[PDB]
Ligand binder design. Structure first.
Ligand SMILES: *[C@@H]1O[C@H](CO)[C@@H](O[C@@H]2O[C@H](CO)[C@@H](O)[C@H](O)[C@H]2NC(C)=O)[C@H](O)[C@H]1NC(C)=O
Ligand SMILES: *[C@@H]1O[C@H](CO)[C@@H](O[C@@H]2O[C@H](CO)[C@@H](O)[C@H](O)[C@H]2NC(C)=O)[C@H](O)[C@H]1NC(C)=O
Ligand SMILES: CC(=O)N[C@@H]1[C@@H](O)[C@H](O)[C@@H](CO)O[C@H]1O
Ligand SMILES: CC(=O)N[C@@H]1[C@@H](O)[C@H](O)[C@@H](CO)O[C@H]1O
Ligand SMILES: CC(=O)N[C@@H]1[C@@H](O)[C@H](O)[C@@H](CO)O[C@H]1O
Ligand SMILES: CC(=O)N[C@@H]1[C@@H](O)[C@H](O)[C@@H](CO)O[C@H]1O
Ligand SMILES: CC(=O)N[C@@H]1[C@@H](O)[C@H](O)[C@@H](CO)O[C@H]1O
Ligand SMILES: CC(=O)N[C@@H]1[C@@H](O)[C@H](O)[C@@H](CO)O[C@H]1O
Ligand SMILES: CC(=O)N[C@@H]1[C@@H](O)[C@H](O)[C@@H](CO)O[C@H]1O
Ligand SMILES: CC(=O)N[C@@H]1[C@@H](O)[C@H](O)[C@@H](CO)O[C@H]1O
Ligand SMILES: *[C@@H]1O[C@H](CO)[C@@H](O)[C@H](O)[C@H]1NC(C)=O
Ligand SMILES: *[C@@H]1O[C@H](CO)[C@@H](O)[C@H](O)[C@H]1NC(C)=O
Ligand SMILES: *[C@@H]1O[C@H](CO)[C@@H](O)[C@H](O)[C@H]1NC(C)=O
Ligand SMILES: *[C@@H]1O[C@H](CO)[C@@H](O)[C@H](O)[C@H]1NC(C)=O
Ligand SMILES: C[C@@H]1O[C@@H](O)[C@@H](O)[C@H](O)[C@@H]1O
Ligand SMILES: C[C@@H]1O[C@@H](O)[C@@H](O)[C@H](O)[C@@H]1O
Ligand SMILES: C[C@@H]1O[C@@H](O)[C@@H](O)[C@H](O)[C@@H]1O
Ligand SMILES: C[C@@H]1O[C@@H](O)[C@@H](O)[C@H](O)[C@@H]1O
Ligand SMILES: [Ca+2]
Ligand SMILES: [Ca+2]
Ligand SMILES: [Cl-]
Ligand SMILES: [Cl-]
Ligand SMILES: [Cl-]
Ligand SMILES: [Cl-]
Ligand SMILES: [K+]
Ligand code: NA
Ligand code: NA
Lengths: 527, 527
C-alpha cells in the first residue's frame, strides 16, 4: 500500500512487476478543475483539494476527440486511437516512480502528439514503467485538451482565448514543480519530451515566459513549432471559430454570445463540425491549434526564434527516415497500404494538389522540379518515393533542422539524430519504410521486453536509446559511455553533425537533406 | 593509316570506333631489349632501335606466370588470367590516343596488379579506349616481369639484384617521357594509376628517387607498399632465392654460379617451383616481390614514409567495401563460391590459421577477440562476415588508410574514397559483396557501353568516376563540377574525411574503420 501526500491530498498508487523489479504507478491523478459547463473553452482552473485518498490505479478519461476510422480492425492505425472513455472531464496525469522510492530522481515529462486534434497519455507505446524500472527516472505524462475544445480562439477574449491545451500542459508542469518531491523527484531536473505535435508543444514551452521555470531541458521527436502545420494565424483562427459557429447554428452578433451558445452544444456537434471549418484540408490539417494569443505566446514564434528570445538550455532533436509516408494513404490517389503503390507522374501531380491545396500552379511545379530529377535509372518507384520525401521534408525534417540551427546559434548545446530503423513488427507495408511515430516504442523501451517478439538487435538498440535519453535528461549530454559507443557530437551551424540510430552501425554524418532543405527553407516560403 | 615517329623508330597504330567517334590504338610497342638468355633476372636494357615500321596493331605477349586454375570455366576467376601467349619476351606497352590527335593531353599510366606474381596489361577491364574517347586523355599501360623472373633477389648482386619488374615499369615511364609528345601527350602531366600490387607499385614510385621526375601525380586503388604482402625482407628474399635453387637443382657455392644455373632452366621449371620456396603460404602469398635493393628502394619503405622522404604531390587513394572476401574461397574451410558459406566458430578459427600461418596462438586469439564481439543478434553469418573483414582490413583497408594519413602529414593534398557498389553483372555470389578488383571496370568506363548489360545507374556512376579520375589527373582535384555533385574534401589527419562511391547517394564520411585500424596498426604489429 503506497500512499503519497500531495499539495491537494492523498493519492494511492499500484505496484507493478517489471523485469524482476517493481515500479509504483499512479495513474489518473487530477491536476485541474474539470473544464465543463461555464469552463469549456477557458484556461484550466486550479484544483480545489480533496480529503480522503484519491485512487490513482487506472488510466483516466481521454479528452474528446475525433477518431481515425480509415482502417477499422487494423492495428497500425488503431494503436493510435484512445483506449479510455472520451470525456470533457479529462485533465489528469500519470506518475511512474522506481521502487524503492528514489531520493532525488530526474523527471521526464511526456507530451503526446496527434495534430493537436487527437491523442492520449494512456497509449501502450507511452507506458513509462520501463524507463522508471531501468533508468530509475520518474516519468510523468498528462492529458491535455485537443481540437476546438483545446484550441478554439477568439483572440483576446478570455471566454475562448486560444491555447487552452498548451495551458493544460503548463498547469501539469506546475503540478510537478509543487508535488514531485513527495514522490522522490527533483523539480530542479525536469526534461520535457514529446513527438510530432507533442514535440511542437515542447518547442513552444521553450518560448513561453510562463514555462521557463517549470523545466530544465527539452527533447523534440519529429516536431517543432516552425513546422507549417504547427501554428494557426489570428486571421485563420477567427475565421475558423466563426465557421464553426455558422455550422452549429451559433452565429451571433456579440462574440461572447457566440461562445455562450457554443457552450450549450453537445461535444459531438462540435467534433462533427471541426473538419469543415476549413475550405480544403490535407491529411496534415490542424484545424484548431496553437495561436499567437498574447499570453502563452507573446509574439510570432518565428520572430522569437530568430531573435533569440527563448529559454537557454540544451536540446535533443531528431527525425525518422520516412516521416511523410504514413500520410500518403489518407488521400493521395494511387496509394494503398495493401499494395506497393507504384504511382504515375500524373498521380504524383494530383498528390501535390492533396498536400498543397492553397498553393499556386508555379509553387507546385517548383516542387515537382526539385523532386523529380531522377538519378537516373528508370526505376518504377520514383514517383512514389518522391511524394513521401516531399511530404516528410516539408512537414517534419527541414523544419526540425532549421529549428535546431537557429536555437544553437545562440550558444546552447544541441544534439540531432536521424532514426533509420524499421521495426521488425511494423504492421504497415514495407514501402512505407521507417515511419513517422515508430521511434517512440524504442524511446519507451518496449523492446526491452523479451516476451514481446522484437529481435535481439532491437532490444540492444532500444537499450542504448533509453540510456542516451536518460543521460541527456540527467546530465545534458546524450552519450552511452560504457559500451564503446559512437560519441554523439553537438550540432553547430556550420558543421551540422548528426547521429544515425540504427541497428547495424551508428554513424556521425553532416548536413542532413542539405539540397532539399535549401528548397523548403529559402525558396518555398516565397511562393 | 596513322604512323608516329618515335625515338627508336616508326610505329603504326589502328583506328577504333568508340561511341560514334574514333580512338587510335598502338598496341604492343616494345620498350626494352627482350630479357632473355644472359638478360634473364637483370635490369631491363634500353632498346636498340629499328628501321621500317613497327606494327602496333595487336596486344603483345604477357610475361611468364602461373595461372589461376581454381575455377576452370568460371568467368569470375578466368577474366583475370592472361589472354595473350606467355613468353619471357614480354616488355611491351600500349598507347590509346584520342582522334583527332590531341595537342598536349594529360597521360594516365596504368600498372596492373596480381600479387607481383601475375597479371597483364591486355585484359579487357584495362582497355584504355573508353577513357581516351570520353575524357580525351592518353592512356598508357605496360607489361612488367612478375614472379621470380621479375623479383628474384640476391641483394647487391647485379646478376639478380631484385626489383627488376619495378625497373621494367620505370623504363616504361622513361619511354613516355621521351616519346609521348609525338603522340600529342604532355610528358609534364602524367598520372600513375594501378590496383592492388599495381597500387603498391605506384606507392613505391612515389618513394624511388629515379621515378620522381617521370610523373606528376598518383592514384592508388586497393594497395600501397605498407600492406603486409607488399615488400619482402632481405632475409626472406635470400632464403627464397636459395630455396628456389635447392628445388631446381641449382644449389652451388658461388652465388653468381647459382644464377648462371638458374638461367639455363626452362621457364616452366622455375614457375613450377615458385609456390614451394616458402614453408606455408596463404592465398595472399607474394613469394617474389619488391625488396630493399639499395637501388630502386634506398631504405626500408616504412622509414621513408614516416620521415617524409618521397615525392611531394597530390594522391587519390581508395578501397572497396569487401576487399577480403574473394580470398576466402582459395583455402579457408567451409567457404564456397557455390553456397552461402555459413561457417562455425571452429571454421573461423581454422581460417585464421590459413591466413596467419606464422603468427603465435596469442596473435590469433587477439584477432578473434577484436572481431567476434557480436552486435549482437544471433545472426548465422557472423563468422563468415568476420573472416572477410579480418582479411580485407589487415591486407588492404587499414594499410591504405595509414599510407594516406602519413603521406598527407607532410603538407600534400590527399583524397580518399570508399567504393561500395556491387556490379549488377558480378558472377561471384552475393555474400562476397563489393569485391576486390571490381571497381576497375568502373574506372575504365566499361559501363559507358550501353550494349553491355550494366544498369543506367551504373553508367551514370561510371561516368562520374571517369570524370573525377580525369579531373584529378589533369588538375589535381577529383571533382565532378557540372552536375551538382558532392564536393570531394581533402583527407587530413585529424578529420580524415572520405567520399563514398555508390549508385544511390554519394556521401562524405569520417574515420573509416577507426576501431579495426587501431587494432591492426597499433597493436597487431607488436604480436
Ligand atoms: C493499389 O491500390 C490502389 C488503391 O485502390 C489502387 O488505386 C485505384 O486505382 C484505380 C484504377 O483501378 C483508380 O481509378 C482508383 O480510384 C484508385 N482507387 C482509390 C480508392 O484511390 C492502385 O491502382 C493499386 N496499385 C497497384 C496494384 O499497383
Ligand atoms: C558449402 O560448400 C563447402 C565447400 O565444400 C562445404 O564445405 C565442406 O563441408 C564438409 C562437410 O561435408 C567438410 O568436411 C569439407 O571438407 C568441406 N569441403 C571443403 C572442400 O572445404 C560447406 O559445408 C558448404 N556449406 C553450406 C552448404 O552451407
Ligand atoms: C473505491 C475507493 O474509493 N477506494 C478504494 C478503497 O475503498 C479500497 O479499500 C482499496 C483496496 O483495493 O482500493 C481503493
Ligand atoms: C482560407 C481562409 O483564409 N478563409 C476561408 C475562406 O476560403 C472561406 O471561403 C470563408 C468562409 O468559409 O472563410 C474561410
Ligand atoms: C461587449 C458586450 O456586449 N458584452 C456583453 C457582456 O457585458 C455580458 O456580460 C454578456 C453576457 O450576457 O453579453 C455580452
Ligand atoms: C468566400 C466564401 O464565403 N466562400 C465560401 C465557399 O468557398 C463555399 O463553397 C461555401 C460553402 O459551400 O461557402 C462560402
Ligand atoms: C607484316 C608487317 O610487318 N607489316 C604490315 C604491312 O606489311 C602491311 O602492308 C600493313 C597493312 O595492313 O600491315 C602491317
Ligand atoms: C620462414 C623463413 O624465414 N625461412 C624458411 C624456413 O622455415 C625454412 O625451413 C628454411 C628452408 O626452407 O628456409 C626458409
Ligand atoms: C666471387 C666469384 O667467385 N666470382 C666469379 C666471377 O669472377 C666469374 O666471372 C664467374 C663466371 O665464371 O664466376 C664467379
Ligand atoms: C629448418 C629447415 O631446414 N626446415 C625445413 C622443413 O621445414 C621442411 O619440412 C623440409 C622439407 O620437407 O626442409 C627443411
Ligand atoms: C536534489 O538536487 C538539487 C540540485 O539539483 C538540490 O538543491 C536539492 O535540494 C536536492 N534534494 C534532495 C537530495 O532531497
Ligand atoms: C552494455 O553492453 C552489455 C553487453 O556487453 C549489455 O548487457 C547492456 O545492456 C549495455 N548497456 C547499455 C546502456 O547499452
Ligand atoms: C604543354 O603544357 C606544358 C605545361 O604543362 C608546356 O610547358 C608545354 O610546352 C606544352 N606543349 C605544347 C602545347 O605543345
Ligand atoms: C552530367 O549529367 C548529364 C545528365 O543530366 C549526363 O548526360 C552527363 O553524363 C553527366 N556528366 C558527368 C561528367 O557525370
Ligand atoms: C462555413 C464554411 O464556409 C466556407 C466553406 O468552404 C467551409 O467548408 C465551411 O463550411
Ligand atoms: C487495394 C485497392 O484498394 C482500394 C480499391 O479501390 C481497389 O479496388 C484496390 O483493391
Ligand atoms: C627447399 C625448401 O625447404 C623448406 C620447405 O619448408 C620448403 O617448402 C622448401 O621446399
Ligand atoms: C559446394 C561444395 O563444394 C565442395 C565439395 O567438397 C562439397 O561437396 C560441396 O558440394
Ligand atoms: Ca508497433
Ligand atoms: Ca565483371
Ligand atoms: Cl507535365
Ligand atoms: Cl561536410
Ligand atoms: Cl574457444
Ligand atoms: Cl568524426
Ligand atoms: K525556384
Ligand atoms: Na475502432
Ligand atoms: Na583456363
Amino acid at each position: 500500500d503506497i500512499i503519497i501526500a500531495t499539495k491537494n491530498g492523498k493519492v494511492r498508487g499500484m505496484q507493478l512487476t517489471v523485469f524482476g523489479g517493481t515500479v509504483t504507478a499512479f495513474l489518473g491523478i487530477p491536476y485541474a478543475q474539470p473544464p465543463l459547463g461555464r469552463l469549456r473553452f477557458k484556461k484550466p482552473q486550479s484544483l480545489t483539494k480533496w480529503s480522503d485518498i484519491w485512487n490513482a490505479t487506472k488510466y483516466a478519461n481521454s479528452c474528446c476527440q475525433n477518431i481515425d476510422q480509415s482502417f477499422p480492425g487494423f492495428h497500425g492505425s488503431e494503436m493510435w486511437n484512445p483506449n479510455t472513455d472520451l470525456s470533457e472531464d479529462c485533465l489528469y496525469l500519470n506518475v511512474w516512480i522506481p521502487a524503492p522510492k528514489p531520493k532525488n530522481a530526474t523527471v521526464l515529462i511526456w507530451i503526446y502528439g496527434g495534430g493537436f486534434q487527437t491523442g492520449t497519455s494512456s497509449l501502450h507505446v507511452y507506458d513509462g514503467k520501463f524507463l522508471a524500472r531501468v533508468e530509475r527516472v520518474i516519468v510523468v505524462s498528462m492529458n491535455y485538451r485537443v481540437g476546438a475544445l483545446g484550441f478554439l480562439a477568439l483572440p483576446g477574449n478570455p471566454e475562448a482565448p486560444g491555447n487552452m491545451g498548451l495551458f493544460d500542459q503548463q498547469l501539469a508542469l506546475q503540478w510537478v514543480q509543487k508535488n514531485i518531491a513527495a514522490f522522490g523527484g527533483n523539480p530542479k531536473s525536469v526534461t520535457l519530451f514529446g513527438e510530432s505535435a507533442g514535440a511542437a508543444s515542447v518547442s513552444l514551452h521553450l518560448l513561453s515566459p510562463g514555462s521557463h521555470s517549470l523545466f530544465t531541458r527539452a527533447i523534440l521527436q519529429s516536431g517543432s513549432f516552425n513546422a507549417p502545420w504547427a501554428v494557426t494565424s489570428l486571421y485563420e483562427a477567427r475565421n475558423r471559430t466563426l465557421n464553426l459557429a455558422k455550422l452549429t447554428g451559433c452565429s451571433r452578433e456579440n462574440e461572447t454570445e457566440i461562445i455562450k451558445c457554443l457552450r450549450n452544444k453537445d461535444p459531438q456537434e462540435i467534433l462533427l463540425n471541426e473538419a469543415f471549418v476549413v475550405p480544403y484540408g490535407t491529411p496534415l490539417s490542424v484545424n484548431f491549434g496553437p495561436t499567437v494569443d498574447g499570453d502563452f505566446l507573446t509574439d510570432m514564434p518565428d520572430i522569437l526564434l530568430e531573435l533569440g528570445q527563448f529559454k537557454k538550455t540544451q536540446i535533443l532533436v531528431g527525425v525518422n527516415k520516412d516521416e511523410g509516408t504514413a500520410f500518403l494513404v489518407y488521400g493521395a490517389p494511387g496509394f494503398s497500404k495493401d499494395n506497393n503503390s507504384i504511382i504515375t507522374r500524373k498521380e504524383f501531380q494530383e498528390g501535390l494538389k492533396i498536400f498543397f491545396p492553397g498553393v499556386s500552379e508555379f509553387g507546385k511545379e517548383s516542387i515537382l522540379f526539385h523532386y523529380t530529377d531522377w538519378v537516373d535509372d528508370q526505376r518504377p518507384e520514383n514517383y512514389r518515393e518522391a511524394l513521401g520525401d516531399v511530404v516528410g521534408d516539408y512537414n517534419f525534417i527541414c523544419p526540425a533542422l532549421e529549428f535546431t540551427k537557429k536555437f544553437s546559434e545562440w550558444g546552447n548545446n544541441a544534439f540531432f539524430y536521424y532514426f533509420e530503423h524499421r521495426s521488425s513488427k511494423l504492421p504497415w507495408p514495407e514501402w512505407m519504410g521507417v515511419m513517422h511515430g515508430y521511434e517512440i516504442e524504442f524511446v519507451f523501451g518496449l523492446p526491452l521486453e523479451r516476451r514481446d517478439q522484437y529481435t535481439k538487435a532491437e532490444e540492444i538498440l532500444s537499450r542504448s536509446i533509453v540510456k542516451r535519453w536518460a543521460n541527456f535528461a540527467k546530465y545534458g549530454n546524450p552519450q552511452e559511455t560504457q559500451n564503446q559507443s559512437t560519441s554523439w557530437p553537438v550540432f553547430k551551424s556550420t558543421e551540422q553533425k548528426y547521429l544515425t540510430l540504427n541497428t547495424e552501425s551508428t554513424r556521425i554524418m553532416t548536413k542532413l537533406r542539405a539540397q532539399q532543405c535549401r528548397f523548403w527553407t529559402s525558396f518555398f516560403p516565397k511562393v
